[PDB]
Every structure is written in C-alpha cells, then in structure tokens.
Design a protein around this ligand. Sequence first.
Ligand SMILES: *[C@@H]1O[C@H](CO)[C@@H](O)[C@H](O)[C@H]1NC(C)=O
Ligand SMILES: *[C@@H]1O[C@H](CO)[C@@H](O)[C@H](O)[C@H]1NC(C)=O
Length: 212
Amino acid sequence: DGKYAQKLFNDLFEDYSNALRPVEDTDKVLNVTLQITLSQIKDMDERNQILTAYLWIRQIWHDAYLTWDRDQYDGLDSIRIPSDLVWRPDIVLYNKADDEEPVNTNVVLRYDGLITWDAPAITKSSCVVDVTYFPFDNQQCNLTFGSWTYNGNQVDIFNALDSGDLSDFIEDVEWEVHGMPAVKNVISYGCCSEPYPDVTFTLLLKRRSHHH
Ligand SMILES: *[C@@H]1O[C@H](CO)[C@@H](O)[C@H](O)[C@H]1NC(C)=O
Ligand SMILES: *[C@@H]1O[C@H](CO)[C@@H](O)[C@H](O)[C@H]1NC(C)=O
C-alpha cells in the first residue's frame, strides 16, 4: 500500500526544482532552525589546535511547493525523500580548517511542507587554548554554521536549542565537555548591506582529571 506514497511523489515532483528557494514570493525570507547533537569528540589535536568532531545536524524549514492534501492520498501525512531531491539551504561549517567525503540521507517531509533533515557530519575546526580558568588546561572550539549560498534576507538561520545537544555522545579520554552554548550572529557591512547570519556553538573542553 505504498501506492499512495508513489502517487504523492509523482505528484509533488511533476514540476519542482531543487534549485529554487521554495517561497511563494521572492522577497519573503525562508527560516531554518538548526540543532547540533554532538556524537563524539574524535580528536583534539593540540599540536595543530584542531578539533575533529562527529555531529548530527538537524535542519528544519518549510518548503512552499511540497505540500499536499492528506485526504487525496489515503491519509498519508509524511514521506521520506532522498535529500538531494529537495531544495536545501546549503548550511555548512564556515570555519572549516580542513582539506576538505559525502554520505547520503533522506529528509522527512510532512504534508504541510515541513521538512526535517537529520544528517551526520565530521567537522574540523580550530580551537583556542585557555589556561586562565580552572582547571587551567582548556580549549574553546567554535563551530560556526551558515548558508554558503544565501544571505539573511533569503535564508535566515536560528538555533533550535540554547546549546548543542550533549545528551548522548561517545566522550573523549583526555577532554571533558564543560558546555556548548549557542548564539546567533548577524553581520551587515557598511551603512546598507544585506545581513549575513550564522549560528555559533562554543564547545568548551577542559582536561579530564585523573585524581580525586
Ligand atoms: C521567519 O522567522 C521569524 C520568527 O522569529 C518570523 O518573524 C517570520 O515571520 C518568519 N517568516 C517566515 C516567512 O516564515
Ligand atoms: C567563539 O564564538 C563566540 C560566539 O560568536 C564569540 O563570542 C567568541 O569570540 C568566539 N571565539 C573566538 C576565539 O573567536
């Protein structure tokens, strides 16, 4: 009984471009919320001052062109669609230190155009040491995310949460996570430029104690 999911798919995509920002009117902004879930601290390189982190990135937004009437599809109200088929906001890690592989994913598309996209990621980024605050062996590792393609009048980005999600991550032997607070920064240039937003997570690491 996937008959309806196929009908929907064929219907949604008869005339649909994954290159067109999916708003009904071009001067409307499209908002995206971002949540970062830390999965593991793969490597803290103190020689290069580079953090390698494994994350889950969750992006949520509305697509104006991918809606449908549940009644016309035997109640079907959600479908999983390869992510390459839909327009995406092109949110990437701005402060990559890296070179810098792909891994394919699906989005969940709800009948009201709401797209939820969970995708794994590996980030390499530079960190700054601090030995001012206890235990005097710490790292401040910023991760800054933003659209590579769109300015803030086109795509505006927001934190879903006050901080990165640290509920479940593999945990590193040398470094403890002290926090990962999130902020949003919007920069505009000179008197009159378009805005350029990002969200930044500051992962605060402190050297693990092995004493007591
Ligand atoms: C985008 O985000 C803000 C929510 O804080 C809201 O004011 C605005 O209405 C939203 N616009 C659209 C088109 O969703
Ligand atoms: C890290 O990001 C936060 C929030 O944007 C910022 O306040 C802080 O200056 C950044 N740290 C460095 C070393 O750039």
